[PDB]
Design a protein around this nucleic acid. Structure first.
Lengths: 98, 103, 94, 80, 95, 106, 99, 87
DNA sequence: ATCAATATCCACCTGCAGATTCTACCAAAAGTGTATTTGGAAACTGCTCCATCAAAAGGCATGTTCAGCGGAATTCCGCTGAACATGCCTTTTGATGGAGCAGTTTCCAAATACACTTTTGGTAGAATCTGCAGGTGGATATTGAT
DNA sequence: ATCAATATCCACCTGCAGATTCTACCAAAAGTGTATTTGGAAACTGCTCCATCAAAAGGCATGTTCAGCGGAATTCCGCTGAACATGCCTTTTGATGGAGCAGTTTCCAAATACACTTTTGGTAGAATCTGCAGGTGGATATTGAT
């Protein structure tokens, strides 16, 4: 009845995803989001597939880096679990400021 | 060709044309494209040099985006130069804050 | 039709000098092309401002040099400048 | 089911992992979705502005590349 | 001796239009002049790239309009566009 | 002879702006409507900041706008603050603001 | 026994005082020498328009005041009211001035 | 020909009181004793970077005098646009 | 301090998506030869303003004492997230009309170029102006001890 | 909650640095009026490649259990703020030499402008080639319960 202790698999995933480069958000779901948000600026638009990809590469690279800063903020507060206030602090200091 | 005269692989003629068609200035001197082409060639050799080593250090003969990212981020200056650049399919450097390690 | 220029071939030549037995994927080549375009624009842009600030109508190798010193990090700039100076010299010597 | 919800918990978790995060609060997933939405709105707004200026009905990769660049998020790999 | 220009007299005309009895210090005027030049450069620059991306050699009021939309935040962009459009339309109605 | 500004109904100099666009090396050619539109946008934005700056001035019982009034007008306005997000107004100081937890007591 | 304000009271008074004013807070001559020393190490025999020095001081102080704001947010985040070197370092790291 | 100065240790001219005042304008209520030296180091790096670029513009123009515009251009290069000095 | 369950590694294999190679086509480049134009270096020098010596004095830096209260260390439990087996619905993959992104030709509204005429923003500078900095004294708080 | 030591607010008053306001020369500007060029909107269209869709593929939604992290409570050493004495050195007001920024003119090395010959990089359908992603086997490390 094997069972890994909390954090062991998490640490395993960190190692696994920092090694690879593939997109981590599912394609179709991301595409629908892109299209929906675009429908608000201009109706009846088409997207080159490479346009959606550039958007996902940019979005993911953005969130991954934001998660790194958020982690540093969690650690600054002597925690190991990230919370919304950590993301908020990071963005505030980034000038995406509030 | 002007590139051969300068001893370069990068296209001096093309660089000249691009400088002109870019509305950077009323006129472009003859030496500008040569100097610029050479700088572009050198920076290219630098990244390919380090990216190639990353491919070797990884037992692969073909340079992929991953290798460009590893070469740029592990190099202080290139990382600085490309500090606001995102290399598609580059991933990140393996790095885990010590305080998160087991024990 | 309508040909799209890129630095793919010149990038390939430089690769062969540095790693004769190394290849490069298409996606990697695209990134390198973006890199050369990006740097070309940053250097040309700075050189453009330099000429403007000094009320000059011409962008010479002098502006390219100062632009490089403004844009590249310490060592990288040192070598870029020497490479540039070397190429202009070899060039002036017919 | 809302599209923003299409950005699942497991996906956000994978992203946090690549970012080196060991444990995540349950409130993070919604927070992240909101943050991602603002990011996409800003980038896409600009991309669409380039699309309309060119009088196209299609958002090209270059529209997105130009959008990311002016946003200080320069991206390599999809042209310019 | 080489005449150095500034938007000073124009900034001053607009000031009298909105606040007839308010003046402005030389330092504040200097800041206003920097503001105008700064925004001029940002708009012109966006219009420049915009034209190059579209292989156009002419910057018309249309690239200026798109640049204003790319550069100014929401409500400021809406109003700048109306004023711009309004000025071009009026200018055009004249000979 | 009527100035292009009056023809456009503007206070800002259309001729000057057209000229600045030409010598700035922005494009090979600059259309006639370009400087008219740009001059108008510039005028509109200065009117916007002066309206708010003059208000900050009167709020502070002053008749003359100084840098601090320009900074107060810009930083208290969401959009102007965003447009000048990476700009430093000399002698403008900052907005009064003390974090809650720093206030004395319970 | 002589009147004494409690610790923090004068500090809050000073915050209100300086957030209300706009004068430069670093002594003028001392800042100028620092500028000259740093510049000299880069290039000898330089001269400075006095306004170049003042432009440097306005930018330097605006940079520092804004850095102290971020630093303050970092200390408060850690449940403190006292800013420390690590708060400054975290702020500069998230700013990309270090990252 | 003429004089002798040699400038040294001028970073100490950025005193504890000056740094406290800047922190106050920044909204800081309490300050660790280690902050003063940490701030001097940060200021020094800030000044070295801006002066390096400003002087680079001076030399490019063949001048011996650093102008307010040299500083203004340097600040803009670094994304620290400054209004009020011809910039 | 035994093994028991899993994840992790390394060596080898090979089908194939993507990289490489010979070829004919050619518009767009790029190199070249020639007559013309011009930006900006060079030499002279007017003249702004940077460096600096000097003196007086008070705003403000320095150094110290004293103790309030903040940061740091410790205990700790309630509870929130991590790990995981279980049922399956949304994503992914590969196929096909057709919407537009482009390639091409026509052609005119509008942008150069250019020789004048004229309205004007800058400015060097004598001058009367005027908003408010800054000292003064006295009324409403704001604090902190008790 | 009453007090007393103090800071904050503030409308009044004034000497003056900094700003609004001429009178005048004006050259770089901006507007006027043809002449010559041409950028790119507009209409027509071939053909990539994008949206839609049905069938094969596999990641995620859901509930349970509890490990261990976050946050509350408590304690106290000594850091850091407040107050104060002393006197240094920054600030302020000025005069002065002259470095060097900057205006003006002479003028040639170098860039613009075609005009035309050479050759090259990009496009493209064809065929051949190959690095390595992914799958398999088995050894070995790691993790976690005794």
């Amino acid at each position: 009845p094997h069972r890994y202790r909390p954090g062991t698999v998490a640490l395993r995933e960190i190692r696994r995803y920092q090694k690879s480069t593939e997109l981590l958000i599912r394609k179709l779901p991301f595409q629908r989001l892109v299209r929906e948000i675009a429908q608000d600026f201009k109706t009846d638009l088409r997207f080159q597939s490479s346009a959606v990809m550039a958007l996902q590469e940019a979005s993911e690279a953005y969130l991954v880096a934001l998660f790194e800063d958020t982690n540093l903020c969690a650690i600054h507060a002597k925690r190991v679990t990230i919370m919304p206030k950590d993301i908020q602090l990071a963005r505030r200091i980034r000038g995406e400021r509030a | 060709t002007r590139s051969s005269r300068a001893g370069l692989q990068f296209p001096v003629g093309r660089v000249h044309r691009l400088l002109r068609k870019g509305n950077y200035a009323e006129r472009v001197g003859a030496g500008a494209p040569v100097y610029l082409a050479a700088v572009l060639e050198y920076l290219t050799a630098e990244i390919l040099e380090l990216a190639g080593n990353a491919a070797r250090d990884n037992k692969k003969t073909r340079i992929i985006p991953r290798h460009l990212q590893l070469a740029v981020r592990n190099d202080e200056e290139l990382n600085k130069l490309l500090g606001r650049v995102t290399i598609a399919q580059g991933g990140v450097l393996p790095n885990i804050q010590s305080v998160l390690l087991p024990k | 039709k309508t040909r799209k220029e890129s630095y793919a071939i010149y990038v390939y030549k430089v690769l062969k000098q540095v790693h004769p037995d190394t290849g490069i994927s298409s996606k990697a080549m695209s990134i390198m092309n973006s890199f050369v375009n990006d740097v070309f624009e940053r250097i040309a842009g700075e050189a453009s401002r330099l000429a403007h600030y000094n009320k000059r109508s011409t962008i010479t190798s002098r502006e390219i040099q100062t632009a490089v010193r403004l844009l590249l990090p310490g060592e990288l700039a040192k070598h870029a400048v020497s490479e540039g100076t070397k190429a202009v010299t070899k060039y002036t010597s017919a | 089911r809302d599209n923003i919800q299409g950005i699942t918990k497991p996906a956000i978790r994978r992203l946090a992992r690549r970012g080196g995060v060991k444990r995540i609060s349950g409130l993070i997933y919604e927070e992240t979705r909101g943050v991602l939405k603002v990011f996409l709105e800003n980038v896409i707004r600009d991309a669409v502005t380039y699309t309309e200026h060119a009088k196209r009905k299609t958002v090209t990769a270059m529209d997105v590349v130009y959008a990311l660049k002016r946003q200080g998020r320069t991206l390599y790999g999809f042209g310019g």
